[PDB]
Paper text:
Here, we present the cryoEM structure of the KATP channel harboring the neonatal diabetes Q52R mutation (hereinafter referred to as the SUR1/Kir6.2Q52R channel) in an open conformation bound to amphipathic molecules consistent with natural C18:0/C20:4 long-chain PI(4,5)P2. At each Kir6.2-SUR1 interface, one PIP2 molecule is bound within the site that is conserved among Kir channels (referred to as the canonical site), and a second PIP2 molecule is at an adjacent site, stacked within the regulatory interface between Kir6.2 and SUR1-TMD0 (referred to as the non-canonical site). First, C18:0/C20:4 PI(4,5)P2 is the dominant species in the brain PIP2 present in our sample (~75%), and both amphipathic molecule densities have map features for the phospho-head groups as well as long acyl chains consistent with C18:0/C20:4 PI(4,5)P2 (monomer ID PT5). In addition to lipid densities at the SUR1-Kir6.2 interface, three other well-resolved lipid map features at the inner leaflet of the membrane bilayer were bound between SUR1-TMD0 and SUR1-TMD1. These were best modeled by the common phospholipids phosphatidylethanolamine and phosphatidylserine. The structure of the PIP2-bound SUR1/Kir6.2Q52R channel has an open Kir6.2 inner helix gate. In the PIP2-bound open SUR1/Kir6.2Q52R structure, the two NBDs of SUR1 are not well resolved; in particular, NBD2 is highly dynamic with a local resolution > 5 Å. However, the two NBDs are clearly separated, as predicted since no MgATP or MgADP was added to the sample. The ABC modules of the four SUR1 subunits in the PIP2-bound open SUR1/Kir6.2Q52R map from a C4 non-uniform refinement adopt a propeller-like conformation. Further 3D classification of the symmetry-expanded particle set revealed three distinct rotational positions of the SUR1-ABC module relative to the Kir6.2/SUR1-TMD0 tetrameric core.
ATP-sensitive potassium (KATP) channels, composed of four pore-lining Kir6.2 subunits and four regulatory sulfonylurea receptor 1 (SUR1) subunits, control insulin secretion in pancreatic β-cells. KATP channel opening is stimulated by PIP2 and inhibited by ATP. Mutations that increase channel opening by PIP2 reduce ATP inhibition and cause neonatal diabetes. In addition to adenine nucleotides-dependent regulation, membrane phosphoinositides participate in the gating activation of KATP channels, as they do all other eukaryotic Kir channels.
Author numbering:
A (entry chain E): 1 to 272, 281 to 615
B (entry chain E): 997 to 1043, 1060 to 1286
C (entry chain A), D (entry chain B): 32 to 352
The structure:
Amino acid sequence: MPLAFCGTENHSAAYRVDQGVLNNGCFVDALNVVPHVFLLFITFPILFIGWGSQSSKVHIHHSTWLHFPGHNLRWILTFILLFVLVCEIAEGILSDGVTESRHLHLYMPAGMAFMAAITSVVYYHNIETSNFPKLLIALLIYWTLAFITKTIKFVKFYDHAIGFSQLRFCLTGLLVILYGMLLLVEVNVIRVRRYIFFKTPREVKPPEDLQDLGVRFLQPFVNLLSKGTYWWMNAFIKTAHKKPIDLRAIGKLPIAMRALTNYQRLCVAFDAPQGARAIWRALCHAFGRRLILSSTFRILADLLGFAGPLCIFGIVDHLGKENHVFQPKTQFLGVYFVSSQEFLGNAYVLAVLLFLALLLQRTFLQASYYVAIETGINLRGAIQTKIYNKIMHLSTSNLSMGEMTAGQICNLVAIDTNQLMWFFFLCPNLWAMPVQIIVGVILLYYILGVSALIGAAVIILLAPVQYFVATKLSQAQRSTLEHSNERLKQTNEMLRGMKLLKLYAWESIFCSRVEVTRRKEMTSLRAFAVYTSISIFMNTAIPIAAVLITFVGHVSFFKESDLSPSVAFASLSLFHILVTPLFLLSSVVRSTVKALVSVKKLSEFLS
Amino acid sequence: PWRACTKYLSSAGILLLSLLVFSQLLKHMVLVAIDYWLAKWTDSALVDQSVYAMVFTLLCSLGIVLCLVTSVTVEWTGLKVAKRLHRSLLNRIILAPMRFFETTPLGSILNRFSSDCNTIDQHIPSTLECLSRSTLLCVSALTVISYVTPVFLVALLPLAVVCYFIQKYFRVASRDLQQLDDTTQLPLLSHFAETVEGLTTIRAFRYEARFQQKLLEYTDSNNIASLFLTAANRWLEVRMEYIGACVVLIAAATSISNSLHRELSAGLVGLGLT
Amino acid sequence: RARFVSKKGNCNVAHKNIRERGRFLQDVFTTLVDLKWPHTLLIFTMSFLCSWLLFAMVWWLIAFAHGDLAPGEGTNVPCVTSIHSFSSAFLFSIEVQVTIGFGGRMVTEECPLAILILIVQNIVGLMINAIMLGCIFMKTAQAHRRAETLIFSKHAVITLRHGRLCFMLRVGDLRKSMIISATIHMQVVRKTTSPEGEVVPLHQVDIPMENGVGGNSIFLVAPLIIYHVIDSNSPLYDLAPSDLHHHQDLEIIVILEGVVETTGITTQARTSYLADEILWGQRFVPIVAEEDGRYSVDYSKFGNTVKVPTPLCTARQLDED
Amino acid sequence: RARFVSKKGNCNVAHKNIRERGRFLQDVFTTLVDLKWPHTLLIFTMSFLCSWLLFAMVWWLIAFAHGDLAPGEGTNVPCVTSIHSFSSAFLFSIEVQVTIGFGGRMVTEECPLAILILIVQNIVGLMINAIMLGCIFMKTAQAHRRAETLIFSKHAVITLRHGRLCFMLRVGDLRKSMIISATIHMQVVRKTTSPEGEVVPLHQVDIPMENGVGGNSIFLVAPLIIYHVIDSNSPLYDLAPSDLHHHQDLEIIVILEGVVETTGITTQARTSYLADEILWGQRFVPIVAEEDGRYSVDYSKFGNTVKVPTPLCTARQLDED
Ligand SMILES: CCCCC/C=C/C/C=C\C/C=C/C/C=C/CCCC(=O)O[C@H](COC(=O)CCCCCCCCCCCCCCCCC)COP(=O)(O)O[C@@H]1[C@H](O)[C@H](O)[C@@H](OP(=O)(O)O)[C@H](OP(=O)(O)O)[C@H]1O
Ligand SMILES: CCCCC/C=C/C/C=C\C/C=C/C/C=C/CCCC(=O)O[C@H](COC(=O)CCCCCCCCCCCCCCCCC)COP(=O)(O)O[C@@H]1[C@H](O)[C@H](O)[C@@H](OP(=O)(O)O)[C@H](OP(=O)(O)O)[C@H]1O
Ligand SMILES: CCCCC/C=C/C/C=C\C/C=C/C/C=C\CCCC(=O)O[C@H](COC(=O)CCCCCCCCCCCCCCCCC)COP(=O)(O)O[C@@H]1[C@H](O)[C@H](O)[C@@H](OP(=O)(O)O)[C@H](OP(=O)(O)O)[C@H]1O
Ligand SMILES: *[C@@H]1O[C@H](CO)[C@@H](O)[C@H](O)[C@H]1NC(C)=O
Ligand SMILES: [K+]
Ligand SMILES: [K+]
Ligand SMILES: [K+]
Ligand SMILES: [K+]
């Protein structure tokens, strides 16, 4: 039984092409390899000739590039395409293992589609960087061929009464959609960036920025993948080890977010009084269309967070069940089809799906962080411009004193606008916490029932405790600062003058009350320290209590069946990914009230 | 870096420092056992201390109490070493030569006496405690995977090597970015300090356009340092997450193979994956 | 420092920030021949191997569509005889394209599409055969390797000849064959600032060599002394022996271009003499003798120089006496 | 207006009313190689395909005349074995001419005419194989495509150098390989009327460039500035900055000719600077720098110019002061 594309069953009767070639399942699958080998045989000669040929003495670096229309959509579709093909390869392998012979047509065409899909992304990116809109025809031909050959396979399933119950029917259907949409994207760039059919090759309109302006922060210009992996910074850090950085290598800020363009929109939104309520409306209008983007990534990252425990729950149940019996129980044209329920039954499938689920989740939460921070510092620059404008011109007839208060203004831009900035750093965090919490407890209730409710309730009740000790900790430092300032003031009376204070030999008695001035502050340090230690075992040791109140409660008050490893670890995993997003909840609440004071302070000091 | 950190144990002495090492190491070891017994109990649940497994709960009850005392054991000692550092600096300050004080700027001493000691008091013991539990938990997490499958550790070591290189290139770049962010922080607020005084000497005499635009030079230099520092952190986390996510796939695939290769394991595998 | 041209003729210049990749893509053949040998072998191998695979799938596919892969009974004439699996199709593709034609796997007259592919493969096979075989011979027969047997002196010499200072060097040819239409070009490479303030980092000033009928023409069969007379209009007219130290920013480039007699392709041999590689109080030693009825050239003493009494003044000062 | 030579080197001249078509017919090979690639592929394809068809009919015909096409009984040795229809004859012609030779269809020793055709087809097959394969390699290895990597400046400059106005431009080579025996020719193309009344619509006046040993010879490995000194006998001796507008009828052509080192075939790169493409008060910015031990050329700043103080008077007025 050697390797066979169509499998060696009967007398290799699966190779017969009577009653039409397109009615032979293997031939249609073989026909689907045609687009993929076409893409490899076209792009590889082109990629090698223009990109991989000259090196080590000929540098063709492009420090300027314009994305083709639909760049973001194309990368999104390919990532979906790459994910679906992985499912199709995994689906094929499960069906293939049942038969005595290996049917290569089940996964090899999908496996070779995976290489072509990656190559298309690589081919497109190199073309897109160096314009070459004419070379997009190769992708245009590839998508058309792939769409045609996947439509044929999908149609033949419909003829052979292959419903949505069979997973391979669904995966093929999605590929028709994904190839169809990618075909439209290629048509879209022809319309927007006419380069072949029309006789007017519309001007590329090079970006206003990204010229030789010294811009080194390439985050808003790199491709979508590099935005999610920060690959552009990798080269910058690769040389930062060799040479210390400076304000010159760090370059200039991109035009869209230097300082003024942030303030320019800020004052534009102000057109609508200038009270606290009016301030929030402008900030929401100016920095809301970008803030929701960070929250949306955070929400999706939170949703995929549960994909950890769910895969943990799925893998253990189908692993501890032993049995090891695998049968698709669905054979069409002599080919086994695995149902959707059976597909999510194999441990290997769950492990691979979990691995892909994590990568999307980890990237999304990182993407949520940067967008919030980038928007946060964008507001910080705009706010500082507004504050400076308030102090400067357009502030005629100053009220009295030394401009209200010299000290107040100094800390207003020092430790008050930062609180507003840090509010936007954690603004999605507060919004996304309830969504993760409510789904987390619900999933716990569907795993351990009553016992999970008690374990989740105490963790929820810990949030007021964490805020309660936060106020005590904050007050302790406030009392400490009153004594520390006296200790600092007493010490900083001849400390700077110790060059001449020691000459008079009067420091022998001066450095005798230092302990007294420090003990009055150390006793406040003890109050601050005990509160910190209180928060430690109220945070580090609380997961242990949560596990016990859920575990031993299965018989103390629940009286149910013996817990399985799957339900125990799934709740343990859910608890682990739930306790950690609680410390931020206490912190964001403390930051929320702190920022609310700061914005009120800015609003009242605005006029 | 950290080469001179071999000292500073004198403030912690010997009995106090060893107690923290013994306590901190104990907590992680018990938590490893607590999860291990949970896996064995659940494995034994589906079928001899099988009766209601309160011994494991009792072992879990002492851990939190042992964790409770560890929380203050490392915190109380941190206060005393601050006192000893405060005492040691005070004696040197009194005995500091006047000629050396005159030659030196005598301002760094005041900053070191006040700013550095304040960081040592309220921050360093907390950061060291958090570092100790994190650097120990990962090692413990790098041993439970070995216990569930001694085959995973074959490729675990090369991944940790890549993690070492990534970390080595981040701390160098991040610290320099921290310096620049600290460097650019001073002119921004000092300009505002110069703005509140002599503003009438600026408004009447000058068009004020230069001074306002001069701030934009300060803010831009400040903003770029902030986001470059942010981007370096985001760069670090992503490559760290991908290493972590890759570890999960290797651990899961190896653990599944053993169960299907007649290596038992059973519910013990699910413990390592968490 | 850095050298504009290495002693072996390699040019130490790196081209950076080129933003015209379209030009390289439009010039494909020059790129193909300019590749290093390990890449040329890979491209040569992958050009034929991928061609065989591409048509192997086509031969396999049409045999599938015709039902030839199915062993069900007989009485059916296949498109190509004795094709069973992809390996048979791949072997058949090699036989057709390399024109081996064993005949166990033979095209039959039943499938016009198969005859169509046979026409296409042969036409495509010939074009790939023509370009690749010709390309690898051009790669082999490049004339730059002939320049490895053209040797220059390791040191240049400035000395008095016929009352005027002359920058002399020796160039020889190791091979028995000739360099047809050999030409010598000598240039001075240094940073020169015009009075208007313009600065040229590598201003190449072309200097003449004394030939008697002009210049840029030699008959190189025995090692010649190529020398440039330093006079009022020469760039070296203000060169002093103190200037001949390592860090001077003064480089002399010698270029020898001619048609290789054996091959017929023009070649080019280059060399450079920095400031510290030029000797002031020296003179080349004769290396041409007469043994029996055939002159013998002793290449062992090729670069040897012997000190001679030479004034330590510049060529400008010599005219002023 | 119209351009005599495009910025990319294309010549915008159309030849009209040629009544000597016999000259083109008498020169066939140059026509064959000068065809565009789609025509070259068609001729290459149709040369072999028609050759196979022509002998396919001959093989089919003599098999007909010998009775081989008739399946009546056996005991008769055919001219060529296993030939039944024209498709069999066509397949046999491909096997013989491309020298595949499967052997299912084989020449036998019964028909001397068949042996005669086998001799004729092989001789004709070799000549077509020799000419066409060699022709398509010459088409591929043309040296004009190498000129696509010889960039010129997009603007010319007329600044002051050494006290005299100089028409300057920059020429560079992107490839690592060299241009052997590179020569630069600069010409002025405009309509000049002699005093006798003769008018030359495109009188090409050849202008020299300063080289120091004559001219028409450069060593192009780094981007050189090629400049012509405007003096009494120069054609630009009466050129004023007011004349550098679009509608002036004044064009400068730069020609770079040399042997491609990689290939061995002489190439030619051309460019033209109209009146409005010449900048008066400008000067090229240096781009050659030294990094470590290797000079680095920054091609991003290739054509950039910086304004410099230059008199607004013609070179004629400069001599008159
Ligand atoms: C019981 C079993 C017994 C076994 C016994 C073993 C038996 C082993 C069997 C047979 C092989 C031994 C064969 C002996 C052959 C000599 C070939 C003669 C042609 C020939 O010239 O090739 C030679 C030798 O290399 C090869 O052999 C390269 C030959 C081409 C390789 C093609 C292989 C195809 C790969 C396909 C495989 C994958 C196919 C996949 C199949 C599956 C598909 C479905 C190439 O060597 P070279 O000298 O020309 O190259 C050097 C070198 O590359 C330097 O880098 C280069 O420096 P630069 O150019 O300056 O940068 C030198 O230049 P210089 O002249 O200035 O110094 C060159 O001189
Ligand atoms: C179940 C079935 C499955 C089917 C799957 C499909 C399977 C499809 C199967 C097989 C074919 C795909 C083959 C893949 C081949 C690559 C060939 C490699 C050789 C090769 O180089 O050919 C390439 C590709 O074109 C062809 O392919 C042309 C190849 C020659 C075509 C000969 C065909 C013979 C026709 C006979 C038919 C009629 C026969 C009648 C029979 C009956 C007789 C009784 C030629 O392309 P090129 O790049 O050299 O040409 C361009 C282009 O022409 C531009 O116009 C030209 O501009 P200019 O020269 O400046 O005017 C460009 O010049 P630049 O360099 O300056 O940019 C050239 O670069
Ligand atoms: C059944 C499955 C069938 C699978 C096989 C398919 C068989 C079917 C076969 C052939 C057809 C599929 C053909 C792909 C289709 C359409 C491509 C059209 C785009 C195109 O025109 O190609 C060229 C690139 O030249 C090459 O590299 C072209 C290089 C050759 C391209 C084909 C490679 C041939 C080898 C492939 C075969 C390999 C076989 C083995 C290798 C044989 C080696 C002899 C365009 O690219 P470009 O860079 O020249 O154009 C740029 C660009 O357009 C700019 O916007 C434009 O303005 P500026 O840059 O500002 O001046 C300029 O335009 P110009 O080109 O006019 O100067 C250029 O700068
Ligand atoms: C062929 O195999 C199928 C199994 O799908 C079954 O009908 C039987 O075993 C064989 N039938 C014939 C007619 O050979
Ligand atoms: K044969
Ligand atoms: K042959
Ligand atoms: K043969
Ligand atoms: K035979």
